[PDB]
Design a protein around this ligand. Structure first.
Ligand SMILES: [Ca+2]
Length: 832
């Protein structure tokens, strides 16, 4: 026939006329029909401008088709001349004859075309669709059942996304797939596209990625000494612990760390974690990385609270190391400790944001918490911020068997431009850091005096416990006493600290004491004079009382020997270990190191090239060495998701583009990074990169992927009594940038040549070696465990009445034959 409803057929049976992701078609998708009509008599051919929503021509079921009609007629498109009234359509439903809902929808379709001409656009239509969709449970976004994640699963419709692997929650001691520890060993999913670190190809891409970072400058042709020396492993509790093994193996191979504590300690690496099960996990592996200890919280609870504080003695037991008389080496779990870090600050400011604007909408100018925080930090009665900040760093920096980590935002006002403003705790913390390098070595003993007052003593270099004679030149004139109370109204009393028997009749300097206004570094207006002297057994009598001021809620006194000039107690590493199965060993040579975290989530965008963190770091390279920082923890340098909240580096889109001149990150360019590392190497520090293996966030590319609602362990769960499995999901899963395309897998050939064991050593969790035979030049579902929910929904993929998916063949998409809804494809259909 010359004209008719056959012109509902798509203009062309290809992507030029039909919206598809990977051949698959949506109920929110659009297409170009050959023709359209407003009455049924007169049919006009479309131009390339004339597309229409599929959901006028095709439905998941006859029910949705009935509610489509009823909805549209009640929301504007009634017309009695075409048999469409709220009354003529009232009793339609799933049991209505197919032929009748077809007929009525064809009529509804004419009125929609009348509406479109009356408005000269398809804009109101589009709106009315989106609005209708939200009234249908199976079409609206809430069908994906918030809040959590899906996992990607094998399915023949999406076979390009299949994996034999996706071994999930092989985390910490669960690596071996047999969770029998009766304890907390982490889970796979945090947020964003979760990366499958059990996949052997991805495991090899990780070794490629790490090799790039350890040679960044040289490979990029920037500063040929701008290369990272180790790793801060992000989300260590939330990835296949195979990579933790395989990273230690890389480093040992490249840098021969197993035999030499010297090599090992020049290539420091530390795992982020909040679960003590990691200690045991690393111990069993010979400690290829440091374990993040939890004394940070012991401190905050004992010293930081308003007033509801744990007894002082908690500082002795509240750690992976008991320090009540720690007078041995190589026994403790090699660890890194902290007073504060980026995430600990964020959780204070957030929350203080939930009282400014009530758990409502952060995506706005709720800053003011900072103005309000800074204002609180100066008070004596702090409503929010941590109390005894200096007392917390005093304990941290005098503790044996740890590598302490300093937080950028404690030395500086973090929301100001990078390093423009010193904090009110700068003088106090930098004084303690500098004292650490001059004085802290030997055994440790923490003795509780009265009720709320402890004394932490370090005996000196080569003074192994309170009874040692001392063995080093620096023994006599080293060691430190850190007196700490946590009760503002503690009474006046004289106490006695055993400084060690190596310290009989020795003069001691009042490095830091407590005044009414705050702190003094000159014994000025404190409880004690500038010098005090021990007796013949090493006991030092000291006066103490409680105080209440911006810096001290309780007491803080620090004593060290009188020295005739500058001295450095740091013990050098041996060129041979006393175990050689161990990578890292907790001894005086490890305790000579001190980590610095160089960033905050709330760090601002740089206002000028000079204000770039990489440039400001480079110019202050010698300040960090002066402070005693040996190891520099750089923020993740990767390209970020443009709509990320903090632009911090954890929401990565390109693992290999660390910034350009034209386009830097928050911290700057790559050339500028290479520069800053060269600067830090010249000042004598080693530097580690924050490596992010768990998630990628904001990948631009859509893919048709098969999914199953799951909890954070990656196991299917129910939300309010509902779940789904094996559902189609049009998810943002594909990307990596031009860096992943250029550098991804680029060095695997070189790696296999120099270090073959990397790809012959079978991973614990899979029993398979990492696989260098495939380069990852672009991330997709196949290398991913899944995603947090993307607010798109589960019932959009188009199934034809016979139950199969509608599919459109298209050059890249040849997994099936083209099979399309009759209404938009079948000349035969329309012929009757
Ligand atoms: Ca993960």
């Amino acid at each position: 026939v010359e004209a008719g409803p056959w012109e509902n057929m798509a203009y062309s049976m290809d992507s030029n006329s039909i919206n598809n992701i990977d051949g698959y078609i949506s109920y929110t998708g659009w297409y170009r029909p050959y023709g359209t009509s407003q009455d049924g008599k007169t049919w006009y051919p479309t131009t390339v401008a004339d597309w229409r929503p599929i959901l006028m021509y095709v439905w998941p079921s006859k029910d949705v088709q009935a509610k489509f009609i009823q909805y549209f007629v009640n929301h504007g498109y009634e017309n009695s001349n075409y048999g469409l009234t709220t009354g003529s359509v009232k009793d339609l439903s799933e049991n209505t004859a197919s032929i009748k809902l077809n007929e009525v929808a064809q009529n509804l379709r004419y009125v929609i075309e009348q509406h479109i001409v009356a408005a000269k656009s398809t804009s109101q239509l589009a709106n009315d669709i989106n609005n209708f969709i939200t009234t249908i449970p199976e079409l609206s976004a809430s069908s994906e059942l918030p809040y959590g994640q899906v996992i990607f699963v094998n399915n023949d419709n999406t076979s390009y996304a299949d994996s034999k692997y996706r071994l999930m929650s092989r985390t910490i001691n669960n690596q071996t797939g047999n969770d029998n520890d009766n304890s907390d060993n982490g889970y796979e999913f945090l947020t964003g596209i979760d990366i499958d670190n059990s996949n052997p190809v991805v495991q090899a891409e990780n070794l490629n990625w790490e090799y790039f970072l350890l040679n960044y400058g040289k490979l990029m042709g920037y500063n040929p000494d701008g290369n990272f020396d180790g790793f801060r492993i992000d989300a260590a509790d939330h990835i296949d612990a195979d990579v933790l093994d395989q990273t230690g193996q890389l480093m040992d191979d490249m840098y021969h760390m197993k035999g030499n504590p010297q090599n090992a300690n020049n290539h420091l690496s530390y795992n982020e974690g909040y679960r003590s099960s990691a200690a045991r996990m690393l111990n069993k592996k010979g400690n290829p990385q440091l374990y993040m200890d939890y004394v940070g919280s012991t401190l905050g609870n004992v010293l930081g609270r308003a007033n509801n504080r744990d007894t002082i003695s908690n500082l002795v037991t509240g750690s992976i190391v008991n320090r009540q008389n720690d007078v041995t080496e190589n026994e403790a779990t090699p660890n890194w400790s902290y007073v504060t870090n980026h995430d600990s600050r964020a959780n204070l400011i957030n929350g203080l944001i939930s009282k400014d604007h009530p758990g409502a909408y952060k995506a706005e100018y709720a800053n003011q918490a900072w103005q309000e925080f800074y204002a609180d930090q100066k008070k004596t009665d702090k409503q929010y911020a941590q109390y005894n900040v200096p007392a917390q760093y005093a304990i941290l920096l005098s503790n044996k068997d740890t590598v302490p980590q300093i937080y950028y935002g404690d030395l500086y006002n973090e929301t100001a431009q990078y390093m423009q403003e010193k904090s009110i705790y700068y003088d106090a913390i930098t004084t303690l850091m500098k004292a650490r390098k001059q004085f802290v070595s030997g055994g440790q003993t923490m003795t509780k005096l009265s009720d709320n007052l402890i004394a932490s003593v370090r005996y000196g270099k080569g003074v192994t416990n309170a009874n040692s004679e001392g063995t080093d030149s620096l023994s006599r004139t080293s060691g430190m006493a850190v007196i700490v109370g946590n009760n503002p109204q503690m009474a006046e009393q004289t106490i006695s600290i055993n400084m060690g028997r190596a310290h009989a009749n020795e003069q001691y300097r009042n490095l830091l004491d407590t005044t009414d206004n705050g702190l003094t570094y000159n014994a000025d207006g404190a409880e004690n004079p500038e010098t005090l002297t021990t007796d013949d057994n090493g006991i030092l009598k000291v006066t103490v009382k409680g105080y209440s001021n911006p810096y001290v809620s309780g007491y803080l006194g620090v004593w060290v020997p009188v020295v005739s000039g500058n001295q450095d107690v740091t013990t050098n590493a041996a060129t041979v270990s006393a175990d050689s199965n161990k990578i890292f060993e907790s001894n005086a040579a490890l305790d000579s190191h001190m980590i610095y975290q160089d960033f905050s989530l709330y760090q601002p965008e740089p206002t000028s090239t000079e204000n770039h963190a990489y440039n400001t770091i480079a110019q202050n390279a010698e300040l960090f060495n002066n402070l005693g920082i040996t190891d520099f923890w750089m923020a993740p340098p990767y390209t970020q998701y443009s709509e990320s909240r903090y632009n911090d580096g954890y929401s990565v889109t390109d693992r290999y583009n660390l910034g350009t001149n034209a386009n830097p990150t928050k911290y700057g360019s790559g050339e500028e990074l290479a520069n800053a590392i060269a600067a830090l190497h010249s000042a004598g520090l080693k530097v580690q990169v924050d490596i992010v293996m768990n998630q990628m966030i904001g990948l631009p590319g859509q893919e048709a992927v098969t999914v199953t609602r799951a909890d954070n362990r990656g196991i299917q769960t129910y939300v309010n009594g509902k779940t789904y499995a094996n559902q189609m999901y049009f998810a943002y899963t594909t990307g990596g940038g031009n860096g992943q395309e250029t550098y991804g897998g680029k060095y695997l050939s070189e790696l296999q040549s120099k270090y073959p064991d990397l790809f012959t050593t079978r991973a614990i969790s899979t029993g398979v070696a990492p696989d260098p035979t495939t380069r990852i030049t672009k991330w997709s579902a196949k290398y991913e465990n899944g995603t947090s929910l993307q607010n798109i929904g589960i019932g959009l993929a188009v199934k034809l009445p016979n139950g199969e998916y509608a599919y459109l063949r298209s050059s890249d998409n040849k997994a099936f034959n083209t099979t399309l809804p009759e209404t938009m494809s079948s000349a035969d259909y329309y012929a009757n």
